[PDB]
Design a protein around this ligand. Sequence first.
Ligand SMILES: CCCSc1c(F)c(F)c(S(N)(=O)=O)c(F)c1F
Ligand SMILES: CCCSc1c(F)c(F)c(S(N)(=O)=O)c(F)c1F
Ligand SMILES: [Zn+2]
Length: 257
Amino acid sequence: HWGYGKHNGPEHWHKDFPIAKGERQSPVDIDTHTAKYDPSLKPLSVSYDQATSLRILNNGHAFNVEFDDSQDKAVLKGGPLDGTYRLIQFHFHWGSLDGQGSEHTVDKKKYAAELHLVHWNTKYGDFGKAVQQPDGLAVLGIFLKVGSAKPGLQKVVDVLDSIKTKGKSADFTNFDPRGLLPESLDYWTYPGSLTTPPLLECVTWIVLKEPISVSSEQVLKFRKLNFNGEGEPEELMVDNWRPAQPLKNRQIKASFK
Ligand SMILES: CCCSc1c(F)c(F)c(S(N)(=O)=O)c(F)c1F
Ligand SMILES: CCCSc1c(F)c(F)c(S(N)(=O)=O)c(F)c1F
Ligand SMILES: [Zn+2]
């Protein structure tokens, strides 16, 4: 029964998930001036040409676009990673207002939303055993700013009225996540956690420097979704972000500058 409300939001999560106060929690503020350029970081390899989306689901916290992760189709590697990480799903976090919504911040700046492309390390054989490992996941985070529309996002936007409420799903095939990327793959990276319960400390975060633009209308449609189930009073799905957590002497490493 955790959520994003006054009574069950991020400041309460520690009572059911005590690692909320752990040593490598996410998100964090990215101090750009203190991030360390690491010339030995490799370019990120995003190989999404064979991706197979399957379904979109309103899970009552966000919506997930799900992929077939039963073979190496869409994979992430390179960058700071060892080995190969398979795309399982993506989702977003967003605000009630354009001035908020992202989980990570950049010099305390908040973006209107943040996209998370979640990948699990193939050496652990599937997702549920990967989340138990300290290098189990790689999450590619991409900031969203409001401006010109992102035409690769519109297929997601348009399906949302079919998954308005918690537990609804819809077929969602042939969606190409390459259309959600910015032009540059420059990034920051650090070791962290899931940003939702169970808050497990299993994630290598890779946060792109370059945001994508989405239109006002696109993010407005995200804000029409509901946290509640059908036949319950409406609770708009907004402000589904965890605030920045203590860095606790982790170093954020930059691939650029
Ligand atoms: C007004 C009803 C809230 S009951 C409750 C809660 F308060 C929590 F903090 C959580 S938590 N710690 O998971 O956020 C929880 F699961 C709950 F069920
Ligand atoms: C095991 C928890 C449910 S799946 C999941 C996840 F894998 C994430 F990486 C994230 S995130 N936000 O850390 O990318 C997330 F929110 C999730 F819900
Ligand atoms: Zn997320």
